[PDB]
């Protein structure tokens, strides 16, 4: 007989619940910060190519949740256009191309990213959601 099967399974299911509650509370905090940040800015809800140093991301704020969302690459995470130098006009233009042609596939930091990919992007530097919350 294995000694704490039930009490460990319950701590694990409660662990998963606590992961999801931490994710949701972080989502809520970031959403409210989004509302306070967005105030007085145009094209905050429009995709823009943002330089994260080693790559570009096409991103914006959601109009509803107010969370950061980016153009998604296939079935994975946000499309990160890799740069090969501090100045990479080609990567920047490709990111503009993504905006004009691939913007129907989008991924949002927080709960949605947890559902779609199994992680929230939050509290996991250098992920782009963490860099935004920093």
């Amino acid at each position: 007989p294995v000694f704490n099967e039930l009490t460990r399974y319950m701590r694990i299911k409660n662990t998963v619940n606590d992961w999801k509650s931490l994710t949701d509370s972080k989502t809520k905090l970031e959403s409210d910060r989004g509302r306070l940040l967005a105030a007085g800015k145009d094209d905050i809800f429009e995709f823009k190519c943002v330089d994260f140093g080693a790559y570009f991301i096409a991103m914006r704020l959601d109009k509803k949740t107010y969370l950061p969302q980016a153009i998604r690459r296939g079935t994975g995470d946000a499309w990160m256009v890799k740069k090969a130098a501090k100045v990479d006009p080609s990567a920047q233009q490709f990111c503009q191309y993504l905006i004009k042609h691939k913007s129907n596939n989008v991924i949002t930091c927080g709960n949605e990213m947890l559902n779609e990919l199994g992680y929230s992007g939050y509290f996991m530097s250098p992920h782009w959601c963490s860099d935004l919350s920093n």
Binding site: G74, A84, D88, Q93, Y97
Partner: protein
């Protein structure tokens, strides 16, 4: 970090920034896509290569970043018809 590799991205593998294609104004004659290999070209009379000129920046980007490997290339620096001005324009824009 989840990466859907089914979707192709040239930027994944190109370490040399000058190997990347980028759209630049060709003063007088519109826009062109350029890299160290030269300019993207169209088959100009005599089945030769002439620099592909675009009316707008967006047509250039769309053409450059579309799907195919963009095989037709005109290089003015090493062609037997070297164009030293069009070659200097090339290396100035890179």
């Amino acid at each position: 970090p989840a990466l859907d590799r089914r979707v192709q991205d040239v930027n994944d593998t190109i370490s040399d920034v000058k190997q990347k294609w980028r759209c630049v104004v060709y003063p007088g004659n519109g826009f062109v896509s350029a890299s160290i290999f030269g300019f993207q070209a169209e088959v100009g009379p005599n089945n030769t290569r002439s620099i592909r000129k675009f009316n707008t920046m967006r047509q250039c980007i769309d053409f450059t970043f579309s799907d195919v490997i963009n095989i037709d290339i005109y290089n003015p620096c090493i062609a037997p018809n070297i164009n030293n001005t069009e070659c200097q324009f090339l290396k100035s824009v890179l």
